[model samples]
Structure formats: C-alpha cells, structure tokens
Target chain A: TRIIYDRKFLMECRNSPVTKTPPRDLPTIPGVTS
Target chain B: GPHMLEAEHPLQYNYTFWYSRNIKQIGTFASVEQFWRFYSHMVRPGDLTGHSDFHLFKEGIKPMWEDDANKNGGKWIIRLRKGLASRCWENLILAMLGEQFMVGEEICGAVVSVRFQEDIISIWNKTASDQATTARIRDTLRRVLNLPPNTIMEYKTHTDSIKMP
Candidate 1:
C-alpha cells in the first residue's frame, strides 16, 4: 500500500519521480511536511 | 388470540428459517438454500454497486479499518475500465465464493463500483504489505480473471485512502 504523507510534497515528488512509480526516500506525516 | 403469548408459541421470525453471521461462509447445500433466500429476495448489487454493504468478516473480526483486525490493513484497488462491468462483477463474485485469493483468514471482503466514469473492483486485505500473500492474490486474478499486470493496480492502506482530498 502506498503510504502518502504530505500531499503538497507528494505532488511535488510525483512530478519529479525517479520512475513511473517512484518510492520516496523520505517519509512525512499526512498533509504536513518538515 | 391475535397477539401471540409471551412464553407459549411466540411469533418466531421464520421468513429466514436459518441464520448465518457471515452468509458468504456457508458450507453445504442447506446453507446455500438459506443464502439464496436472503440474497434473491434482497437487493442484488447488479443494479448499482456503489451502495454500502455491511459485509462483516467471520465473527470476531469487524469490517472497518478502525476494527482491531483491520487497523493496519490494505486493499488491492482494481479500477475497471468503462463498460467492463459484466466481467468485473463475475470475477469478483466467483473469487469470493471459490476462495481463490488464498486468503482464508486475512481477507475481510470485497467492494464493487458503478461509477459514471470508470468502475472499480477492490479486495480488502488485513496487513501492512505482505508481498508474498498479495502477489498470490494478484496472480490468481491475472490467471483466473484474465486481468493483466499492466492493468495498473494500486495497493492503499485504509488509513491512506480515508484522508484523500
């Protein structure tokens, strides 16, 4: 299951994905970013 | 005696002669008889699949993510292409009755869709992310249901999907 935290950060990361379905190196809480 | 007596010959609700907590787990033909009686008279999902169903697990386990058994669970999301309702419906129904998901204990239940855009077929599992068990289910769908790897299936935790904007 894809555990997405920060929607804003995820949107940003989704644009610059390492691959079509990229796994983020960092994990943040949902809707909040550090 | 218009009103039945309190202790003698009570009005036993016999419309459903038999009872099952989870009707999906029936064993013999007798059980099937009860099942059809319940489902046939009731609303089938064919007309509309988006409506809610309180499809509970065995007995001890509950259906929602808030339940102790499902607090950390995930579901395999299958977004049916438009006009694929017939196939998706059959596949999901068969999978449940046949127990083809290799998910005797982990699986809670399934959900269907009848969206204006793309329909959906989901199989809810009770775990964080166990690839071995999950892959078995996916492979079964690919082989039995003729779904492909590139169907773009996504797995999402209940916690994750609940907050979707």
Candidate 2:
C-alpha cells in the first residue's frame, strides 16, 4: 500500500532534529560558478 | 499519544515557498510540512528550460531585492551543471528549512533559477558587510551541496546588482 500523508507523520518529521544527511542523492558532476 | 506530545519544530522565521514559470508565481507554501508536500510532487528543476524560478523567502519578504527584508541583503550563488539542479535545489531548501547555516538571523532565503545553460542556486542574507556570517554561509552552502574543493561560488550584494548596466 502507498504511504499516505498523515498529520501524525508530518508532525513527527517537523519536530525531528536536523541532520547532516542529505534527503536525496546528488549527481556526480561537480558544482561550479561563473 | 506520545507522537502528539511532540510539537512542530518551528523555524526562527516563517518562510514562503514560491514557484514561478517564466517569472510568474505558480504556487506558494507556508509551513514546513506543506513545503515538503509541494516539493515532493513538483516538477524537477531539470525539466524546466528558459525562464523558470523556484524561490523560498521569509514570510514577509518577496524574493526580489525591493522587499525591505532583502533590499540591504546579498546573495551567495552556486552554479550547477545540468542533471544536478534538482538535487542541489532539494538539498539547499532542506538546509534552509532546517536552519543548518547557523548564521544567526541574517539568513533570508534561497532561489533556484533555471536557465538554458546552467542552473543558479543562491542563498540570500540580510547583510553583506558581515564578513564572518557571509563566510559561514558560504561554507555551509558548500557542505550542504557537497561540492568539491575546487568548486567556485560568488557572494554579491544587492546594491551591486543596481550597478549593472
């Protein structure tokens, strides 16, 4: 079953401590600046 | 229940999330969870072309420099190549919402400007003269985006933009 967007879950995530772990994977290319 | 005992971890400043296609706002969100609900299903920055922008700023602050909250501020910009825009955008937003920059109250907001060649992601802060805060912000950005040692980024003040022809 698909995970539903529950208020409980949302509240939990919001109250959670911030972590250094990124939410998603980034591409292999290096970031640059002009 | 024990879950309900936990309060929503509010931010020091409330934020507004704005999405624009070709300079027009398409959507906005106010709460942290609301932001995630929108971001998770929104079109990836990589899918856009030409003029599209995703902006997040303090509740009272518009993304533009004209807003009092942003007028005296400056931005720390990082340019990422194709296929990297979506991830960088996601990471940057999370960093801002999580208050990971530790730059006091100076942190304003961030923008992901999508263009034909490369995507520009910038974090705006309230003042440009605070060298220590600016340096911390730049360092946090590099860490959050996980950029390499050689990656180049620029910090420019809002006033500097007015000098442009």
Candidate 3:
C-alpha cells in the first residue's frame, strides 16, 4: 500500500505553506569527519 | 480566485520523530503532508556531519532500548560502506511511511545512523520471537534499498545493545 508522491507534485508543494521551518545545522562527529 | 486544495493521506499509524545529534523527540506526524514538511526540512543523514541519527518510531515508543515497546524487541541492521546514507535513508523512509512492508503492527520503526566508517539503517520490530516477521522485514529492506548482491545485514536484540552499550 504505497502512496506515491510525484517528484514534480512534491516540488510544487515544497513552498505551498505560508511559513517554512528553518533548517538546522548537522553536528559534526570527530571520528566521522576525520 | 481559488482556494488551494490537496488531499492529505493519513498513514496507518502515527509516528514520532526522534533525532540524535545524540536524541530528542522532534514531533509526531500521522498524515503524509506533515511527514514531508519535516522530512523536507531535515538534512539527510549522509549529508549530516557527525554520528547523528533520525528515528521515526511508532508514536509513544521512544527510540531507546529501555523503552517498554523496544526493550524486548530486536532490530535488523544493514551496514553500508559510506556514501549510501542519503539515498538509502529516503528509500527506507518512504517504504516505512507508505506501509510497504505489510507486516501489520510488528514494525516498531526505522533508524538511520550516520557513523564514522559506515552508515547504518535498521528497522526495529516489536517482538524478537517473531522470526517470520523479522525475516519479511529484511527481505523488504533489501528490495527497497536495492543493495548490491554482497550486502550483509545483521540482526541484534535490544538486549545485546543494552548489555554492550
């Protein structure tokens, strides 16, 4: 029962909302970042 | 001239968003729109810098070994040699959100862990005793991720992580 979201449709809805959530920074891990 | 209209598809179960730049509950979403809103805002695990994780478990079930819902369950883990996190994460996310596994309520949720040498994705189930359910999840995971023939998956009980970690 997969509900498919078309890429185009999703892109169009990307900014449909009046306000957008701010993006946050991804923390860096020492061992992972080298 | 017109009011915008879009149909919201509700998933079978509500899911809680959990994140770990080491672990926090972001929110919960029962509809597809809400999921995309947050998922779209999120940085993909591969692109994320450190040992972070994004967990989407059934609402009320914290993504912890100590949680009652998870304490007795186990997870099926797939370790990927770096570079597949973002792609695999999206695939796994969609599969879980869309109820593609068809395993009923056996699914606890899924997690994507960004690590040093590898990126790990695992789906936790409610019962370690249900070998059949676990087996179905693995098969679906392999197909959904479309991993190479040599890919390996490991299943570990919460009891193991509890004892070791």
Candidate 4:
C-alpha cells in the first residue's frame, strides 16, 4: 500500500533529539469519570 | 511419524522492545523466537507500578511521539484494572507482533503503561485523519483483546497529546 509521505515532518522527526528517559508526566484524559 | 518443527514467524517490520522503569532499550527482535526469549523472562505488567511503561515499536521508530514513525500518529487507548492488566498487555503485545490488525504499515507501535491506579494499553498508528483505518484498528484491538461490549477505548492524536501532556 502506498502512503502519502510528508518530507518536512519526517525530516523534523528524524532530526528531533532522542531522549534517554521515557516520558514520566503523561496527562490524564479530561472528563474521565473514573 | 513425528512432524518437523516449523520456523519462527517473521514479522513484516522489525520491532524493538523498550523497557521504561529505568528507561532503556531491551533489545530488537525480528522473529517470534526472539520475542518469546525476551517476553518470557520480563516483568509482567501487573507486577509493575508507578509510571513504568513497556513499549514495542517498529525498528528505526522510537517509542516516543517525536519519532519519525509516530510524530503524526495517534493511539487507541484502553484502560484495564489491576488484576486484568498482565493478560491484556500480553494479548495486545502478541496481537501487535503478530500483525493481527492488518492495517498495513500504519501501525507504529504499542505501549503498556503500568500505573498505580490502573494500567493502560495503547496501539499507536501513523495516521490521525484516516478515520476508516483508525476505526478498523480500534475494532481489531477490541476483537483481539476480547474486550467486553461496554469497554471504553479512547483515541488520542499525537498533536493532542502534545497539548495535553
């Protein structure tokens, strides 16, 4: 299957810094009853 | 006569298993044999607590949203109760590695988040605007995980996650 490629975004992501630590502060969903 | 053992299954994409308690690469595996070697001895999701995460993403694709494979993507999230987490996580991982979703190359990875209150399992896909594909991915998740009819599965785009997280 062919996918639409976005060169700019791909480049940005490829150039983005790699983090040594996994994300710790994930935000909770808003209006979650439980 | 005894039949010969078959070779381990090969996935279309190479995947990397990521462990996040201390945050490091566990290893990358391209075959089922390697996956089991790593999975069998690893800590179960139910045993973990307080912000631990197990991430499995395609090779060259980091588990983070900032990675090229995940930057424009979104995830299908399901929250499971404490005792239920380990089984659900295992099932999700197998489904992902098995390529059961059949969503082509849109899949980026899957994550099992071990939190004190509840555990969360999510499968990330590369396209956020592809509604038909995303729905299929969600339905496949529900089927493979054998989720109950009333289970709540949420979809969160990476862009949205950036704003929220």
Per-prediction DockQ, in order? 0.01, 0.05, 0.14, 0.02
Task: Indicate which candidate wins on TM-score.
Answer: 3
lDDT of 2 by residue, B1-165 (tens): 355553333445667656665333334554565565545545677776677787877777788888787866899988888788888887887778777788778988889988888889999999888899999998888887878878899999998867697
TM-score, ranked from best to worst? 3, 4, 2, 1
TM-score of chain B of 4: 0.91
By lDDT, is 1 or 3 better? Answer: 3
**Candidate 4 regions with alpha-carbon error over 4 angstroms:** A1-34, B1-6
| Better-scoring candidate (TM-score), 3 or 4 | 3
Give the native contact fraction of candidate 3: 0.05
Interface RMSD of each: 24.8, 12.8, 6.4, 14.2
Q: Regarding lDDT, does 2 or 3 come out ahead?
A: 3
TM-score of chain B of each: 0.66, 0.86, 0.93, 0.91
Question: What's the lDDT for residue B139 in model 4?
Answer: 88
Candidate 3: list runs displaced more than 4 Å.
Answer: A1-34
Q: Candidate 1 has which clashing residue pairs, if any?
A: none
Report the lDDT of model 2 for residue B164.
91
- Compared with the true structure, all predictions reach lDDT values of 0.49, 0.70, 0.76, 0.72
Candidate 3: TM-score? 0.82
lDDT of 1 at B88: 64
lDDT score of residue B127 within candidate 4: 89
